[PDB]
Design an enzyme around this catalytic site. Structure first.
Site, short mmCIF file in Angstrom:
data_model
loop_
_atom_site.label_atom_id
_atom_site.label_comp_id
_atom_site.label_asym_id
_atom_site.label_seq_id
_atom_site.Cartn_x
_atom_site.Cartn_y
_atom_site.Cartn_z
N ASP B 25 0.89 -1.14 0.00
CA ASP B 25 0.00 0.00 0.00
C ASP B 25 0.93 1.20 0.00
O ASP B 25 2.10 1.08 0.38
CB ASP B 25 -0.90 -0.01 1.23
CG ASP B 25 -1.74 1.25 1.36
OD1 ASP B 25 -2.39 1.62 0.37
OD2 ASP B 25 -1.76 1.85 2.44
N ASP B 27 0.14 5.17 0.78
CA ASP B 27 0.02 6.10 1.89
C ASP B 27 0.02 5.35 3.21
O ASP B 27 -0.77 4.42 3.41
CB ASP B 27 -1.25 6.95 1.77
CG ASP B 27 -1.55 7.75 3.05
OD1 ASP B 27 -2.14 7.17 3.99
OD2 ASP B 27 -1.18 8.94 3.12
C1 LIG Z 1 -8.07 10.92 -1.54
C2 LIG Z 1 -7.45 9.70 -0.94
N1 LIG Z 1 -7.94 8.51 -1.30
C3 LIG Z 1 -7.42 7.39 -0.80
C4 LIG Z 1 -6.37 7.46 0.11
C5 LIG Z 1 -5.80 6.21 0.65
C6 LIG Z 1 -4.66 5.72 -0.16
P1 LIG Z 1 -3.79 4.22 0.32
O1 LIG Z 1 -3.31 4.28 1.74
O2 LIG Z 1 -2.58 4.08 -0.66
O3 LIG Z 1 -4.73 2.99 0.13
C7 LIG Z 1 -5.84 8.68 0.50
C8 LIG Z 1 -4.70 8.73 1.47
O4 LIG Z 1 -4.16 9.97 1.76
C9 LIG Z 1 -6.40 9.84 -0.04
O5 LIG Z 1 -5.93 11.10 0.31
MG LIG Z 2 -2.59 3.39 3.49
#
Ligand SMILES: Cc1ncc(CCP(=O)(O)O)c(CO)c1O
Ligand SMILES: [Mg+2]
Ligand SMILES: Cc1ncc(CCP(=O)(O)O)c(CO)c1O
Ligand SMILES: [Mg+2]
Lengths: 291, 291
Positions: B25, B27
């Site tokens: 993953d 973020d």
């Molecule tokens: C608009 C938006 N949509 C989804 C996420 C989560 C991303 P992830 O942790 O890579 O699954 C985020 C995380 O910051 C976000 O800002």
């Molecule tokens: Mg994440």
């Protein structure tokens, strides 16, 4: 008994009415559709008054504060109604917020409102302070979600900021998901906005409007109402009729609004008893045969 | 059955060697905002040299694949291929293409609640959008993404299109909210999907985690043995649940949304699908089992 969605006519109609001390009418879809009143509604309310049967009114519409809603009744042809008889989700929302936010001086907070002017006015009339009103903004102690045509991602974010504080209440006027308009289109309802706020804040909202029993509680605090002797008349199964069942009244679906006879009968065969009206009429006007 | 035991020492060396590759993953794992996780870039290199494939999954629907590839580079992650990156925007475009390729030569447009990156991703797939220059075809699908321009106005439109039962409702993901650098929250697509679903009276096809379709996108592009694959994420209700549903081994890292105690709470509650097999404080700790 267990509702069987029988058409209310003749003897049945005469028994049921004569038995009743009063009637609770939902407004939209029952008394009127837009600016076009349901033919006969004005006459019915009058003849109910002569028979000595009390009338009260419920609405999940949070656009008009009680005064303007009283004016609406007047302007449209409904005579001899008092504002005390009108219980909107806005009114009941203000009343809950006053119950939950009463406190010593130094205990007062602001309410952050996602909704229109009418809703704000209703809250002020109850003595509540609003965020975004002129002057010092106290600590927000409540978020209220109503019908908000100015709903935005920006303000959803703001509501959530306030709700980060677990001591901040989340109230919603109602959960109606959408409403029909004159041109045949729909408008999102507080239910869809509440869904967004709840989801985004990770919180459950205290809902005041139908089919929440709280709306009926507001009514019983203002008037003596015996649910056994009261008829709940509405046009929506999932709000009005379910409301009637939870409150112990006799339910009457009218067909001049959202729900249809066939929709009700589906719930009946399906065995979802709380979504089936005891009786039904084509119009509330048909109820006059019993007077 | 996951026991959420910390992955250290011998265990870490075994588990890594076992795997074909790791699914990261983004973020909360590789970075938080503009601040990369110390060691993360170094970890990827050592994973590639060790001959372990790396793929990346993200429910972020703001960035089209090209810009997401730039982000990796700019932040210090070198030698990555765009094919390794799988966002909810990407797979949403891929699904809409799969569901709207019907044999009729009469194609339609997608109404998109989301930013340029999301729209960009759909254009890259060959889909036409409402609000683009020119004749607007019949809207054949509504897509709900992270939409900072969400409005009651646009919600209303989405519902108008959805009155047509042959119009699809797709959502990028159901994430309810996300934490920001400053510590505030922003509503997630989940909250926006909740509003659209509620007001339209419809269920959305969800594309992102923890829906398996994210994994389907990945398997069509690469041979992946879930048994030999590590799912590394920071969120229990999307990353770890995704991991289990796909049959992979799950590793919670603590640099993001979820906490060790939240995982352990799910453990006691007996919700196995939300409990990580292993956990680390950072993904950096995974280098102890490499060279
Ligand atoms: C608009 C938006 N949509 C989804 C996420 C989560 C991303 P992830 O942790 O890579 O699954 C985020 C995380 O910051 C976000 O800002
Ligand atoms: Mg994440
Ligand atoms: C903005 C708004 N909010 C609530 C309602 C429901 C009215 P009711 O049928 O009286 O419960 C309506 C009815 O159309 C409305 O327009
Ligand atoms: Mg109604």
């Amino acid at each position: 008994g267990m509702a069987r969605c029988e058409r209310l006519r003749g003897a049945a109609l005469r028994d049921v009415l004569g038995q009743a001390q009063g009637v609770l009418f939902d407004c939209d879809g029952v008394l009127w559709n837009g600016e076009r009143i349901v033919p006969g509604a004005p006459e019915l309310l009058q003849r109910l008054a002569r028979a000595g049967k009390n009338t009260l009114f419920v609405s999940n519409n949070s656009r008009r504060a009680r005064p303007e809603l009283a004016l609406r009744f007047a302007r449209l042809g409904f005579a001899g109604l008092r504002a005390e008889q009108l219980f909107s989700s806005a009114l009941c929302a203000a009343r809950l917020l006053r119950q939950r936010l009463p406190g010593p001086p130094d205990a007062s907070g602001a309410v952050f409102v996602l909704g229109g002017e009418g809703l704000r006015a209703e809250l002020r009339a109850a003595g509540l302070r609003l965020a975004g009103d002129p002057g010092e903004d106290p600590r927000v102690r409540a978020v209220l979600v109503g019908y908000d045509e100015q709903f935005s991602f920006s303000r959803l974010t703001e509501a959530c900021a306030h709700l980060r504080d677990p001591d901040c209440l989340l109230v919603a006027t109602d959960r109606d998901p959408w409403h029909p308009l004159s041109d045949g289109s729909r408008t999102p309802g507080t239910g869809s906005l509440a869904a967004a706020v709840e989801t985004a804040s990770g919180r459950q909202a205290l809902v005041v409007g139908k089919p929440s029993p709280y709306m009926f509680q507001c009514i019983t605090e203002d008037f003596s109402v015996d649910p056994a002797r009261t008829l709940m008349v509405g046009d929506r199964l999932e709000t009005d009729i379910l409301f009637g069942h939870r409150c112990g009244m006799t339910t009457v679906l009218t067909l001049t609004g959202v729900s249809s006879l066939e929709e009700a009968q589906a719930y009946l065969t399906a065995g979802q008893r709380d979504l089936v009206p005891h009786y039904y009429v084509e119009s509330i006007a048909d109820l006059m045969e019993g007077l």
